[PDB]
Every structure is written in C-alpha cells, then in structure tokens.
Amino acid sequence: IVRPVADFSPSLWGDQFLSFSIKNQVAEKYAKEIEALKEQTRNMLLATGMKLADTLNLIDTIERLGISYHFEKEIDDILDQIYNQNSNCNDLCTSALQFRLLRQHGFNISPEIFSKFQDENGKFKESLASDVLGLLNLYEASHVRTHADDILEDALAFSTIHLESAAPHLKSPLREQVTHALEQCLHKGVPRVETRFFISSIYDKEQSKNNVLLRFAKLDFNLLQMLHKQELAQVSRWWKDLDFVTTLPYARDRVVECYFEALGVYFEPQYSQARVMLVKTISMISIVDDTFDAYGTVKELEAYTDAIQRWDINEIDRLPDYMKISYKAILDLYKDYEKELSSAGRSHIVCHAIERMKEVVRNYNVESTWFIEGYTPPVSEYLSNALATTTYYYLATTSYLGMKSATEQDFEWLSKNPKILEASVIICRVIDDTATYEVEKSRGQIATGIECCMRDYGISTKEAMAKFQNMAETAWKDINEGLLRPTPVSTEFLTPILNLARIVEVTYIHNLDGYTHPEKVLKPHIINLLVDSIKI
Ligand SMILES: [Mg+2]
Ligand SMILES: [Mg+2]
Ligand SMILES: [Mg+2]
C-alpha cells in the first residue's frame, strides 16, 4: 500500500531548546529584588486619594506590563469600588478605559457611559476625532462588547478611521502603540506576547515611565522566562525520547509551537504542572491528526478509532505497526497523568480528558469518511462534526488537569459544552476554515467549511467568508458575556477558554495557518518569549 510522501517542513529549532541550565545566582537575585519591587507596587495601588483617571491608568499599566497576576486581589477591590460608585468622568479616554477594565474583570458596567460622547443617532461625535488618547482607549474598549452593547456598534470603525489618520504624525512611542493596536487589539492578543511588546517597545521608551514598575516588569518577565525555558527543555527531552521524528516521519515536528500554545493558555508559575501536561496533549493529538489526514487508509483509521474507543492495552494487536507506536504512547501519557496527580488525590479527573479525546478521534474518522465519499454536508451538519475536530473541547478540558484548584464540579460544567466554551470552539473552527480554505480545497477536501457554506446557501467564496467572519464576531460577544458576573465557575477556569480564542486570533492573523507555517506567524513570538530575554 503506497502512501503520500511527507511535505511538512522539519523543525526550525533543531536542538536549541533541548537543555537549559538555570543560573540560580541570577534567579535568586531577581526573585529577591522582585519581592521588594512587588511591595513598592502594592503600596502604589493601595495609595489613597488617587483620582479616578490615575487609578485606572496605574491598573492598566500594571496589566500591560504583565505583572498584574501578583495583585489580583488589590486590583479587584479597586475595580469593584469603582464599579459600585458608578462615577462619571466626562473624559472619553477615562470612560473607555473604565469600561474596558471593568468588563474584562466581569463587572457589567453599563454602556450608557458612552452616550454623552454620541449624537442623536448614537453615532460618536466627530468632534472627538482629534483626541488621540480617547480614540485609542475607545478602540481597545470596542473589542469587549456583548450583545447588549449595540450603543458601541460604531466605536470600532470610528476610532479606526481616525487613529489611522493621526498615526503618521504622532510622537514616539505613542505612534508605535497606536500602529500596533490597529494590527492587534489588546483584548484579543496572547498576554505574554502583548506584555513583551509593551515592555520593550512602548513603556521602556516612555519619558513619563515609572522606573519601579519598568524594572519590576523586566525582572519578572525574564524570571518567568527561565521557568518556561526549563519546562520547554523538559518537554523537548520527553519528545526526543519518544522519537516519532524518525519512527513516524509523516507527522509534523512541532513541539515548540505546541509549547507556545500552552504558554498562551497560561504563563503564571503556579500553572507549570498544568502547562507541561497541556503541551504533551497538544503534541500527541497533533500526531493523531497527521495520521488521519496524510497517511492512514480507511481500514487502519477505523481500527484506530475503535481501538481509541475501547482504550485498552489489550487492543494494540489490531493496529498496523505504525499505529501501535502512537496508540501505546497515548495510553502511557494518560497513565503518566494519573500518577502525576495521585499525591494530590486528583487522579480521578483524567477520565474527562480521555472522553474528550475519544470524541476528537470519532470526528476525525467521520471527516475522513466524508472526504473519501466526496460528501459536502450542510453547514449545520458540518459544524456538528467539525467543531470537535478543532480539538478545542479537548484542550480546554486538558487545561484543567494540572490546575490544583479544579474540582469534579468544574469538569461537569465543562462537559455540558457551556456557551463560553462553544464560542471559543466556533472561533477556532471558522477562522481556521477561512484561512485554510484555498489550500485544502487544492487537496480535494470536498467537505471543507467554506465549501459546505457556499453549497448550502448558494453563495460565493467571499460571501461565505463574510458569514464565517460574523460567526466569529458573534462568538466573541458570547465569550465577553460569559465572563460577566455572576460567573458559572471561578474566573480561573474561564480565562483558559478565553486564551484559547486569543491563540486563534494570533495564529491566523491576516489569514495564514501559523501552526503549519510557523516561520511566518509563530517564529517571532517564540523568539521573543523563549529565546531573547528583555535587555535590562
Ligand atoms: Mg487536519
Ligand atoms: Mg484531520
Ligand atoms: Mg483546517
């Protein structure tokens, strides 16, 4: 039986991540100074008599510098008190910032704060077009809308057109901040990526900058980077010992891109165990996906699928030799997870991630069947299968495995496919289909999302892409609404789902697959997050 020959690119990275040896003198020096810098910062936040605008700017800056995770409780109290005071600044800049920060933290502040900035038709007063700081903060706020927020329906276009017009004549680094915002809004970016751009390209170059906060942010970023490098090295060794790069040469070699995805889901050190477990799943499921998409035949794929459903080390013998490799690796990985979680008494939650994996495999196989039969389903039927093949239900469930505070009840809410999770899954699916359409159509994938959408509604490739765009925008409103209090689970368990959607926006920016073409999209981010430290 002849196979299709491998056309995926080898790893850009070689061995450069395989061993990282932390300099503990540096590490312990950084940590000792950070503690002093941390407390000076706490006292800035707890300073009394601050005006509203200065308080929001302080919180905003600490968040953009990537250090707010040290002050979750302090920032919460301050925003809560601001929420309940329901103050009214007449400043567009302060109003838009107040709106965004509160909404991003779950406080359902009313969009009527923007009415004083609009005319009769609820269109923004064009006299505000010369207030660049107002437009910037309005622009960032325009991305955290829910469905109750149509008063803001004009904010994105209004702020965009005038930021575009003003940008070339702005001073630095404001000009670079505005230009970056137009390319990547804050709310939908990956946090470490935006933090690193803000520290090095913006705050470092601000004459007004606060030296305590800047030094804090540089040391903390570089200190956390040392941890991430340890994790990546330990994950690179685990991947090396598996050796699929030689035994399964059809498969993509992308463990570093997978680690970046895990790092976008959470970066804080308390999630180190959760991150390592997560990368291993993303890597492993990536292999299954290449098996289905570029190597196995119908009968091997059926035996693989059924073996996955039965999930028993008695079943290896039914698979061809190449499938025995991954199948045992999959089963081992999950026994590893169960052992990893035993000392905390949390081994019993691994079954939830396993059930989601079985679901992904079932739907991979359906997708193969559709490709072989030349079947083009209607959109609703396409989605019923293709949403799970994003892997995003699986990854979200996986993301909880290493989170020591995640309980059985948390997994039960997630098993019911809650609305915030569905929207994140929908964002991944429709953005991916828009970006991968023309290429996987060239490979004859008759059942690709845009195709189903054209055939179903009888519309052009362009009208189908616009329909998929609106599905993404609807999903972002649902994500944003799913973060508002009272939340159905702790916000700690919502942020990974939000971050999975951010990963989508960052990976397919301006519409190229970035995990399969990592050198265009993901390579600069991996260098900036995992190779180069921030120059102090
Ligand atoms: Mg695929
Ligand atoms: Mg596939
Ligand atoms: Mg695709």
From Swiss-Prot:
Monomer. A motif (DDXXD motif) lies at residues 289-293. Pathway: Secondary metabolite biosynthesis; terpenoid biosynthesis. GO terms for biological process: diterpenoid biosynthetic process; sesquiterpene biosynthetic process. Signal peptide: none annotated. Inhibited activity toward farnesyl diphosphate (FPP) by anilinogeranyl diphosphate (AGPP); AGPP undergoes a cyclization event leading to the formation of a novel macrocyclic paracyclophane alkaloid. Repressed by sesquilavandulyl diphosphate (SPP) via the induction of self-alkyation. The gene is EAS3. Disulfide bonds: none annotated. Mg(2+) 1 binds at D289, D293. Belongs to the terpene synthase family. Its cofactor is Mg(2+). This is 5-epi-aristolochene synthase. One of its GO terms (molecular function) is magnesium ion binding. Changing L395I: Catalyzes the conversion of (2E,6E)-farnesyl diphosphate to (+)-5-epi-aristolochene and triggers self-alkyation of D-432 and Y-508 leading to enzyme inactivation. Self-alkylated at Tyr-508 in the presence of (2Z,6E)-farnesyl diphosphate ((Z,E)-FPP). Self-alkylated at Asp-432 at warm temperature (42 degrees Celsius) in the presence of (2E,6E)-farnesyl diphosphate ((E,E)-FPP). Catalyzes the cyclization of trans,trans-farnesyl diphosphate (FPP) to the bicyclic intermediate 5-epi-aristolochene, initial step in the conversion of FPP to the sesquiterpenoid antifungal phytoalexin capsidiol. Produces germacrene A as an enzyme-bound intermediate that is not released by the enzyme, but is further cyclized to produce the bicyclic 5-epi-aristolochene. Mediates, at low levels, the formation of 4-epi-eremophilene and premnaspirodiene from trans,trans-farnesyl diphosphate. Its EC number is 4.2.3.61, 4.2.3.226, 4.2.3.227. It comes from Nicotiana tabacum (Common tobacco). It catalyses: (2E,6E)-farnesyl diphosphate = (+)-5-epi-aristolochene + diphosphate; (2Z,6E)-farnesyl diphosphate = (+)-2-epi-prezizaene + diphosphate; (2Z,6E)-farnesyl diphosphate = (-)-alpha-cedrene + diphosphate; (2Z,6E)-farnesyl diphosphate = (-)-beta-curcumene + diphosphate. Mg(2+) 3 binds at D432, D433, T436, E440.
